[PDB]
Amino acid sequence: AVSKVYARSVYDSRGNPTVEVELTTEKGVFRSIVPSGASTGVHEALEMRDGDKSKWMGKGVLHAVKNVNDVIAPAFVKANIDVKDQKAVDDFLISLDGTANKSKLGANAILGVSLAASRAAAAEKNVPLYKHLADLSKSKTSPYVLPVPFLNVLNGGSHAGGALALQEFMIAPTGAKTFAEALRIGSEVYHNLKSLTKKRYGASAGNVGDEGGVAPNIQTAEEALDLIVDAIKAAGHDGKVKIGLDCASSEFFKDGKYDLDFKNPNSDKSKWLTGPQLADLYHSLMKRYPIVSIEDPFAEDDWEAWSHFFKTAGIQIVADDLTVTNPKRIATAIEKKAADALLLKVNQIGTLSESIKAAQDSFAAGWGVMVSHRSGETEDTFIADLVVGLRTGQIKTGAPARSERLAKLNQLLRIEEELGDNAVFAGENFHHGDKL
Amino acid sequence: AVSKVYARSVYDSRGNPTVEVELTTEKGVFRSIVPSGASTGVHEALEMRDGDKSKWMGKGVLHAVKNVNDVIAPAFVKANIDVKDQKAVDDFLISLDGTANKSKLGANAILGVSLAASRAAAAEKNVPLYKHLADLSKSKTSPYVLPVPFLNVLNGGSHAGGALALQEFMIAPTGAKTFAEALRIGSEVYHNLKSLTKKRYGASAGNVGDEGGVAPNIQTAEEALDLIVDAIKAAGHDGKVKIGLDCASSEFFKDGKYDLDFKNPNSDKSKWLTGPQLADLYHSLMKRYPIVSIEDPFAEDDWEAWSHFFKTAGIQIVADDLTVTNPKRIATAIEKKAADALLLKVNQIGTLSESIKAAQDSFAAGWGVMVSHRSGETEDTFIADLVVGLRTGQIKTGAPARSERLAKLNQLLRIEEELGDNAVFAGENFHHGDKL
Ligand SMILES: [Mg+2]
Ligand SMILES: [Mg+2]
Ligand SMILES: [Mg+2]
Ligand SMILES: [Mg+2]
């Protein structure tokens, strides 16, 4: 029984204010913190900011916070809802906002309540969060599946200063036998990468991006990939580690063309690429490097481009800004055969229930599901329990550096240990972890 | 009644393993995570690493973990100690190691148990950590004192790739009325700095160091301070923000001289400076910038240089590597009049009890106490409750970027809120916050 709902302003991993919510019950106080992206898709739910340039550079969230305290709270408490009933909770919240993109109260106002409720519910059932989560989603729990982590060891695009267009370059230790081993191999590659990087491009190149990866000032994907393969090799893990990319192409799409030098204000329009051209580029990288997954190869509404590449790709193709964890967007994606994996971001849609549906819809279509954090994270470890609850077999929560990332990775170590013989690591079958 | 003592290996903010301890009582599970330094003094208690180059590059902690699980555990449980008596807990652990520097079990194995015990006690006494702490240390609680945060917005030395020798360039919002206000302005400054940096030094210059600060490739302190001052002004906080430094001189002390270009393998020996020469430089900077604190201006055992400088300092002079949170070392410094402020690090000494004593002896001698994190941090927020419990009035826990840093800051916002009207912000009186 909820006796209280309260919100406050806290800081994210980038030093920007964010919403933190606290829910009180007979069982105790439950907390949750909302994340925040940088390369946020146009179709994402509304993230409300104060816009006051005299405070936090106009990035405060007093309004959103106010909505929780002044509007949401009173009613919620009055409603007397069963926290164990996620759908109920969410329905209430959505009903309260009334808009399609949560423009009334704001997604960051709603999310926090939604997430806090699930925590309170788990306490009530006297079960671990990932367990309640599996319950909510009707996932198979025998056994549970530990996912393969996709570590963004090299940052580009909007996550770091430099010429690199592509946003994330990740390593996936699909060759590990357990979650612990995977993370060990992952950090080993990471340390080698930092050394090489400094060695090949100067000390400064070893400084890090928003997500904790090294951020060398290079201009081609080839140079980034060469470093990674050399690092994997130097670490002694060749063949056990694969690569995944996050192109975040919408960030550089302009006038129906893709600008690979978009970070340069004086970019050369003649160099801009067409969908098909960009597809040729991707293909070149695929043939040369052990890439097993590409995210956002084409812009958020460039449907034809995704569908075209999809038929020749032959590897996991993840939709991020294209789907925005929105069941309706996914249906279209599914119809157009544009991708084969969903990038799940609680904050793109705004409610847990809606996110769980997105996952269920994807899995129903034979798609894969990759749970993810946002570039602006917090000490909150929700997603760790989530990926296990949903049995996706794959997560992306950063490089093995910067605590907003390790918190989730460490959390996964604790769960694996707890589960013992009741869990298996996804390994090479990460694409369809849910079916393991 | 402690039923179980357990430990596991987790990862720090740089991707290196570390010790995580869990203490189980009738009241629940209490956890603690140990931080790890980079520019560690020769006198620090022993941090135990495995040295198996085939795993984690030799930085494993399996041994320390095993020490806790197989050595400390059984004897601790069987001892039936009362967690409420910190002293008895610590005395027990120390006697068990039996070395001057915790070289048998490792300080990293010991600290986790010591700190975890204090959490369990607080639960038992049904009080917030900071209160239990203020209790353990006989601090005056009316009101409580909230500390000024020293934010390390510009990183150098061993914390980042680049030429900059001095380790940390910090801002301190002493001209704020509340901690919440302090952090607010601190971040605003921070955002301004990052922008300016990128403009003045280039995109890559905005990338960050280990502690969340920007890392421009500059060679002089003046370049650094100039960036900062412009940032303060630009953000509109001219007057409310002061500057602090962590020179970490021990790292560049060689042959009785100081090398301001120590990262350069071709450093110019003729350029190396004498103590008095270095002191000159300092006085030069203090004259031109609102610097209010200097940490480790001289080497760990270069006593005479310290004593010399102290005579005409006229500002807070903090001892770090020189004192290593060691009472015996503190005695010496007080006597030789080397500094007037202690840098408190539980991991430099090893037990909560010993660290408390250190603070007490410092306050007794009329010194101030700056509570501190380590460059290799975790999601643990213990020090937030610690600074408050000791009522020091000042803490250093990083820039407002990277959750290993924000987690502590967020936690202080929470406490501020909770204390309400029963607490004051130290402001301009940080030096003697304990006398407020
Ligand atoms: Mg994005
Ligand atoms: Mg993405
Ligand atoms: Mg140091
Ligand atoms: Mg220091």
Swiss-Prot record, chains A, B:
EC class: lyase
Residues where Phosphothreonine is found: T312, T323
Binding-site list for Mg(2+): D246, E295, D320
Cofactor note: Mg(2+) is required for catalysis and for stabilizing the dimer.
Catalytic activity: (2R)-2-phosphoglycerate = phosphoenolpyruvate + H2O
Positions that bind substrate: H159, E168, E295, D320, S372, H373, R374, S375, K396
GO-annotated biological processes: glycolytic process; regulation of vacuole fusion, non-autophagic
Protein name: Enolase 1
